[PDB]
RNA sequence: UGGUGUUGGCUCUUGGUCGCGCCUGCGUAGGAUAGGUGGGAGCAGGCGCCGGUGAAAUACCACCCUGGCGCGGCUGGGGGCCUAACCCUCGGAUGGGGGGACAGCGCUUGGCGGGCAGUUUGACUGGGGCGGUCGCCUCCUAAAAGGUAACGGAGGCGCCCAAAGGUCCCCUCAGGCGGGACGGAAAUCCGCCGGAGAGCGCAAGGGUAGAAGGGGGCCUGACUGCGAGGCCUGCAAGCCGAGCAGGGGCGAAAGCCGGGCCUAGUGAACCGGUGGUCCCGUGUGGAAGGGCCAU
RNA sequence: UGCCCGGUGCCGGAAGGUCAAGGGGAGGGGUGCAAGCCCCGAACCGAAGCCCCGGUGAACGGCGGCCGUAACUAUAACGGU
RNA sequence: GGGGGGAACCUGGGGAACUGAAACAUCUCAGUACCCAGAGGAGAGGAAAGAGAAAUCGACUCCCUGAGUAGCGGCGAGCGA
RNA sequence: AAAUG
RNA sequence: CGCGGGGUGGAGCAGCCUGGUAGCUCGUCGGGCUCAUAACCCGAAGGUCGUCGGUUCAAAUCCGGCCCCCGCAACCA
């Protein structure tokens, strides 16, 4: 054991107000590394209703960094914009060969429409069920690749509903300045709330919390 | 059974204050599409190319050969 | 009416706020009356000497105000315009407050 | 809401809550009565048809079921995913609405009836290339194709051999 | 239009608006600029 | 047709709902039973990482599922048996039979419903109907101001651009004859000759290289309070607009900017919706609900 | 007294899909010093009807098109789509 | 005791349409026409579980005002305290 | 299983 | 005289709204299996997309005029 004296730091009955779970979320996490503050919420929809699935990203005021290796697969001087954007890996239908055969040392994967074709054609099943493939909804496709690449470093993260009807997403680091994460949370909610499938009967966010990468998850009022 | 019978409500274009007529600052002097006439002395023109007086005075139509046609307004001296 | 067009009922009701249901809010209304005309009588004008005179009448609450010169005389009222309050500061009455 | 006098085969419209597409249209004005529009339709998903008639007035309600070209990416649950090789959006079509979802291929380009950004019909081409990964080197024998489906083929066609198969009859139409 | 879409601008935490027209697909995915509010003067301005 | 009233005895039996907690999820392969999905390099022993495995990986934490039992409250589904309401009957009965808390009937719910009721089923139009047409832009007709008809001739629109907008600085075209590696007959280059035949997102027209065209740097005046004075005009609308204030952009400055070279890209009121605002707020305070601004 | 049950009708389907009152109250809000009083309100349980699966013609009804081909021609028993 | 009659007037129980909206359905015409029961020289109404903002008034009916106001309203026609 | 000369 | 749809390899049909892709079946020629012919198996060739214009960077496709095509109507007298 060890979580016991760690779990007492949560009022199982109570309802916090973000902030409340902010000062707290820091006393909740304690490890031999900086834990990332996770967030979960049982949204009221049906997976089986193809339309209601939720795929959308959000640029955060605080948190999120170049803690990611993004690959820009394109044609033209797009590369120049990309490389100058911070495209750790660059190269069109020649790099597809890297990934296609073994290679796999990145997180995100931006691309340009023009070379996008071949991508999903020969990379579909690989990074497809991996959610890495470029998708408009999850803005990782296009030509303005500049801002795009430059942004996956500042604070824009995706979040697609799972099959159980829930969605989770890292809102920042554990040793984060108090009001930053708490503020970084509303940013995440206000965007997911802003994405309600038109025919979603009932109340949307049904169960929303504030956890730490390793341990305790204090449920809160997603309107705090 | 035809394929026509259409047109657009006339717009009533052209000079709307001739040379030697007294105006007031504001009077639109000319309504036109291109720039058949161009701004002159105390004669600014608008978005739609509509020349209009800039000061109380008279209107003069200076023809400038291949330089176009002008409409000035020599204020009352 | 007529033509079968739209009268000129195209123009809108900006007259916003013109009717809830219980009705009209019973509140106190004020009657003008410019000092210009109390000048008619010289004594102690009281909202009544006024109604009976030929101005204000039952409208209730009197608010002497406006144009005209004041006069040396006490004026009981329910209100005064900043300006007449002045023109009366030239020596006269100022029985504001009023009412029991 | 388009009327009828203004229909044309190909026009897609919403009738009886369902999706159709006039395939036969003939203005009818006999005797001195009012004109009439007599058409024949086809559901967009099921094949079901139905000839009907309407007066000159009666409006119908045009629909926007344009047919972009999607693309298979990968299976998942009892569904399979495609993509409009155009705007690269992601469509999770339920196995039912994917005509011949089998005999398909995780990477093949097919067609879908986009109705409000959701395919209601996903057809591949009449015949596609597929690598048989089964069959006994033993004539008209069964052969499991790379997509798990099985097909009847001749002899010479042996394991690893890529063939063609009419996606409507799932019949061996020759080799690669 | 659809790919077009209407939209306004909010003074950053508050009221007022401008109401322009973004343009989906093309340069989109959010957008803010500098513009003057009925109250006080000049600031950023986000969509919504 | 559900819920209730009239409507009552006695039992038999099954779920479903969420709250919580404990389980649970078994094809290859992986020293093995992989529910997803987001975190994740760590949490005298160990664990994962890393390597291998597969579509996915593996710890520890999350959320939440599939299905399962456990208590806590909450709701239902039927199976029978009964007799006394209610119904039907019986050589005429405060009684006997049969049905039986069903049906019938009362209030209420959703639905089917030309059996019946009220109505609607446009105008122009070389008669009507069928066809075609109906608002907006351009050209002609249109008779050298404006305006002007026809089921006269001929075409467009219901959008679009975050640069295709401001500003400041730069640049000048289409074609034609040479001349040139891959190179049509114009890919790129060089030389002349070329005032506009190019271009100006889209129809046509007027316009325009002493830019309205092309390129680049900063920017967002696609300002808010205003609006003298006019165009057009039956009304309603539509269009131009100098100057002032606030607060900005560009420029050294002069200045320029309250969208777009210009004429289409549209929709009165009503009724509602969203913000804002603090204006009214039915004895008082406060709400309910309105109002004004915005959309 | 042939053939067609895809469409409509009627008949049959103790499962599913959408389902109205009503039940249920997470949770929210207006007021009160407070007990309170008063309003919204999600999960979920709620008939028939419709969807959905089948049946059905002495139920409403429906019952193809373009090419080619035979010892002269024609024509087409035949074949193609 | 009752029963039937009585020109209007009265109360109560029922209750239209043509019309107007320049169609029409909500709305209007109108709780009118009419039917039925009853009442009587009259009938109804009538001593506050009222009004409504006034330290207020003080059954009821009836006329004049308030008032075409407050309002109501496919915020239309128009109805109207 | 499998037509004809 | 209008009303709508149609002219794509030899035949019969896709493709046309959503301009850059010629898809199908039979047929044809080549080669196998047979003594041979079918069938059957292997492989190949073939389309000014009805024409004449225009729009576009480009058209089977979008736009107009014609030419043939198929079906529908022509009523009150
Ligand atoms: Mg005409
Ligand atoms: Mg005309
Ligand atoms: Mg005209
Ligand atoms: Mg004109
Ligand atoms: Mg009208
Ligand atoms: Mg019994
Ligand atoms: Mg009995
Ligand atoms: Mg009995
Ligand atoms: Mg019995
Ligand atoms: Mg009953
Ligand atoms: Mg009913
Ligand atoms: Mg009916
Ligand atoms: Mg009828
Ligand atoms: Mg009748
Ligand atoms: Mg009537
Ligand atoms: Mg007529
Ligand atoms: Mg005629
Ligand atoms: Mg007609
Ligand atoms: Mg017509
Ligand atoms: Mg008009
Ligand atoms: Mg002329
Ligand atoms: Mg003229
Ligand atoms: Mg040149
Ligand atoms: Mg040359
Ligand atoms: Mg070349
Ligand atoms: Mg050359
Ligand atoms: Mg050239
Ligand atoms: Mg610039
Ligand atoms: Mg003004
Ligand atoms: Mg003026
Ligand atoms: Mg006017
Ligand atoms: Mg414009
Ligand atoms: Mg410009
Ligand atoms: Mg109205
Ligand atoms: Mg309103
Ligand atoms: Mg509101
Ligand atoms: Mg107040
Ligand atoms: Mg009151
Ligand atoms: Mg009150
Ligand atoms: Mg009050
Ligand atoms: Mg209080
Ligand atoms: Mg308000
Ligand atoms: Mg048969
Ligand atoms: Mg049938
Ligand atoms: Mg049937
Ligand atoms: Mg059910
Ligand atoms: Mg059920
Ligand atoms: Mg309820
Ligand atoms: Mg309910
Ligand atoms: Mg309180
Ligand atoms: Mg049911
Ligand atoms: Mg028969
Ligand atoms: Mg039939
Ligand atoms: Mg012959
Ligand atoms: Mg012959
Ligand atoms: Mg012969
Ligand atoms: Mg035959
Ligand atoms: Mg009565
Ligand atoms: Mg009566
Ligand atoms: Mg009526
Ligand atoms: Mg009427
Ligand atoms: Mg009496
Ligand atoms: Mg008397
Ligand atoms: Mg009496
Ligand atoms: Mg009335
Ligand atoms: Mg051969």
From Swiss-Prot, chain B:
Q: What does this protein do?
A: Found on the solvent side of the large subunit.
GO cellular component labels? cytosolic large ribosomal subunit
Family matches, as PANTHER family: LARGE RIBOSOMAL SUBUNIT PROTEIN BL27M, RIBOSOMAL PROTEIN L27
Q: Which organism is it from?
A: Thermus thermophilus (strain ATCC 27634 / DSM 579 / HB8)
Write out the GO MF terms.
structural constituent of ribosome
Q: How does it assemble?
A: Part of the 50S ribosomal subunit.
Q: From which domain of life does this come?
A: Bacteria
What would be the name of the gene that encodes this protein? rpmA
Cite the residue spans of the region called Disordered: 1-13
- Identify the taxonomic lineage of the organism of origin: Bacteria, Thermotogati, Deinococcota, Deinococci, Thermales
Task: Provide the alphabetized UniProt keywords.
Answer: Ribonucleoprotein, Ribosomal protein
Query: What is the protein name given in its UniProt record?
Result: Large ribosomal subunit protein bL27
Curated annotation (Swiss-Prot), chain C:
Which spans are transmembrane here?
Answer: none
Q: Which UniProt keywords apply?
A: Ribonucleoprotein, Ribosomal protein, RNA-binding, rRNA-binding
Q: Cellular component terms, GO, for this chain's entry?
A: cytosolic large ribosomal subunit
Q: Which GO terms describe its biological process?
A: translation
Q: Name one GO molecular function term.
A: structural constituent of ribosome
Job of this protein: Binds to the 23S rRNA.
Give the family from UniProt: Belongs to the universal ribosomal protein uL15 family.
Q: How does it assemble?
A: Part of the 50S ribosomal subunit.
Q: What is this protein called?
A: Large ribosomal subunit protein uL15
Q: Which species does this protein come from? A: Thermus thermophilus (strain ATCC 27634 / DSM 579 / HB8)
Per the record, the gene is: rplO
Curated annotation (Swiss-Prot), chain D:
Signal sequence, start to end: none
Organism superkingdom: Bacteria
Annotated pathway, please?
Protein biosynthesis; polypeptide chain elongation
Q: Write out the GO biological process terms.
A: peptide biosynthetic process
NCBIfam families this protein is in?
Answer: efp (TIGR00038), PRK00529.1 (NF001810)
Instruction: Give one Pfam family.
Output: EFP_N
Q: Where in the cell is it found?
A: Cytoplasm
- One GO CC term on file: cytoplasm
The protein's predominant localisation is cytoplasm
**Annotated keywords:** Cytoplasm, Elongation factor, Protein biosynthesis
Question: Does the UniProt entry include the keyword Protein biosynthesis?
Answer: yes
Q: Which InterPro entries match?
A: Elong-fact-P_C, NA-bd_OB-fold, Rib_uL2_dom2, Transl_elong_fac_P/YeiP, Transl_elong_KOW-like, Transl_elong_P/YeiP_cen, Transl_elong_P/YeiP_CS, Transl_elongation_fac_P
A Gene Ontology molecular function term for this protein is: translation elongation factor activity
Q: Which family does it belong to?
A: Belongs to the elongation factor P family.
User: Any idea what job this protein has?
Assistant: Involved in peptide bond synthesis. Stimulates efficient translation and peptide-bond synthesis on native or reconstituted 70S ribosomes in vitro. Probably functions indirectly by altering the affinity of the ribosome for aminoacyl-tRNA, thus increasing their reactivity as acceptors for peptidyl transferase.
Protein name per UniProt: Elongation factor P
UniProtKB/Swiss-Prot annotation, chain E:
Please state what the protein is called: Large ribosomal subunit protein bL33
Q: Does the keyword Ribosomal protein apply?
A: yes
Organism of this sequence: Thermus thermophilus (strain ATCC 27634 / DSM 579 / HB8)
Q: Which domain of life is it from?
A: Bacteria
Q: Which PROSITE patterns match?
A: RIBOSOMAL_L33
The question of whether Transport is a record keyword is answered with no
Q: Name one GO molecular function term.
A: tRNA binding
Q: Which InterPro entries match?
A: Ribosomal_bL33, Ribosomal_bL33_CS, Ribosomal_bL33_sf, Ribosomal_zn-bd
Q: How does it assemble?
A: Part of the 50S ribosomal subunit.
User: What GO terms describe the biological role, i.e. biological process, of this protein?
Assistant: translation
Q: Which SUPFAM superfamilies does UniProt cross-reference here?
A: Zn-binding ribosomal proteins (SSF57829)
What family, per the record?
A: Belongs to the bacterial ribosomal protein bL33 family.
Lineage from the top down? Answer: Bacteria, Thermotogati, Deinococcota, Deinococci, Thermales
Q: What does this protein do?
A: Found on the solvent side of the large subunit.
């Amino acid at each position: 054991k060890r979580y016991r004296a760690l779990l007492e730091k949560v009022d199982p009955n109570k309802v916090y107000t973000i902030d409340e779970a902010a000062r707290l979320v820091k006393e909740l996490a304690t490890a031999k590394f900086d834990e990332t503050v996770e967030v979960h919420a049982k949204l009221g929809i049906d997976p089986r209703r193809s339309d209601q699935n939720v795929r959308g990203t959000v640029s955060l005021p605080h948190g999120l960094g170049k803690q990611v290796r993004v690959l820009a697969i394109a044609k033209g001087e797009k590369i120049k914009e990309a490389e100058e954007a911070g495209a750790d890996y660059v190269g069109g239908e020649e790099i597809i060969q890297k990934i296609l055969d073994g290679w796999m040392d990145f997180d995100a994967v931006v691309a340009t429409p023009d070379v996008m074709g071949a991508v999903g054609s020969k990379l579909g099943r690989i990074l497809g069920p991996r959610g890495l493939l470029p998708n408009p909804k999850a803005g990782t496709v296009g030509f303005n690749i500049g801002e795009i690449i430059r942004e996956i470093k500042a604070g824009r993260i995706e979040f697609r509903n799972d099959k159980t009807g829930a969605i989770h997403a890292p809102v920042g680091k554990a040793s984060f300045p108090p009001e930053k994460l708490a503020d970084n949370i509303r940013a995440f909610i206000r965007a997911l709330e802003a994405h309600k499938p038109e025919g979603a009967k009932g109340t949307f966010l049904r169960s929303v919390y504030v956890t730490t990468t390793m341990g305790p998850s204090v449920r809160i009022n997603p309107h705090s | 059974s035809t394929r026509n019978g259409r047109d657009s409500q006339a717009k009533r274009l052209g000079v709307k204050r001739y040379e030697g007529q007294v105006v007031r600052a504001g009077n639109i002097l000319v309504r036109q599409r291109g720039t058949r006439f161009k701004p002159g002395k105390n004669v600014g023109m608008g978005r739609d190319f509509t020349l209009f007086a800039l000061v109380d005075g008279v209107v003069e139509f200076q023809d400038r050969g291949r330089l176009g046609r002008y409409v000035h307004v020599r204020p009352l001296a | 009416f007529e033509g079968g067009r739209s009268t000129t009922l195209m123009r809108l009701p900006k007259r916003g706020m013109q009717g809830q249901v219980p009705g009209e809010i019973k509140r106190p209304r004020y009657q003008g009356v410019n000092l210009k005309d109390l000048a008619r009588f010289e004594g102690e004008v009281t909202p009544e000497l006024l109604v009976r005179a030929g101005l204000l009448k039952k409208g209730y609450r009197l608010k002497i105000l406006g144009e005209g010169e004041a006069k040396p005389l006490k004026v009981v009222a329910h209100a005064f315009s900043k300006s007449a309050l002045e023109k009366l500061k030239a020596a006269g009455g100022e029985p504001v407050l009023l009412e029991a | 809401m388009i009327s009828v006098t203004d229909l044309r085969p190909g026009t897609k419209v919403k009738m009886d809550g369902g999706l159709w597409e006039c395939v036969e249209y003939q203005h009818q004005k006999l005797g001195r009565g009012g004109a009439k529009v007599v058409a024949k339709f086809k559901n967009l998903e099921t094949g079901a048809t139905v000839e009907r008639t309407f007066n000159s007035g009666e409006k119908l309600e045009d629909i926007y079921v344009e047919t972009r070209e999607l693309q298979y990416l990968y299976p998942e649950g009892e569904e399979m995913v495609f993509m409009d090789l155009e705007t690269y959006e992601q469509f999770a079509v339920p196995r039912s609405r994917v005509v011949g979802a089998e005999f398909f291929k995780e990477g093949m380009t097919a067609l879908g009836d986009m109705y409000e950004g959701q395919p209601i019909k996903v057809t591949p081409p009449t015949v596609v290339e597929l690598k048989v990964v089964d069959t006994p080197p033993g004539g008209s024998k069964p052969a499991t194709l790379e997509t798990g489906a099985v097909v009847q083929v001749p002899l010479f066609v042996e394991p690893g051999e890529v063939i063609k198969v009419d996606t409507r009859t799932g019949e061996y139409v020759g080799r690669a | 239009v659809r790919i077009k879409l209407l939209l306004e601008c909010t003074e950053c935490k508050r009221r007022n608006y401008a109401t322009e027209k973004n343009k989906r697909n093309t340069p989109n995915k959010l957008e803010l600029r500098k513009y003057c509010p009925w109250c006080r003067k000049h600031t950023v301005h986000r969509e919504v």
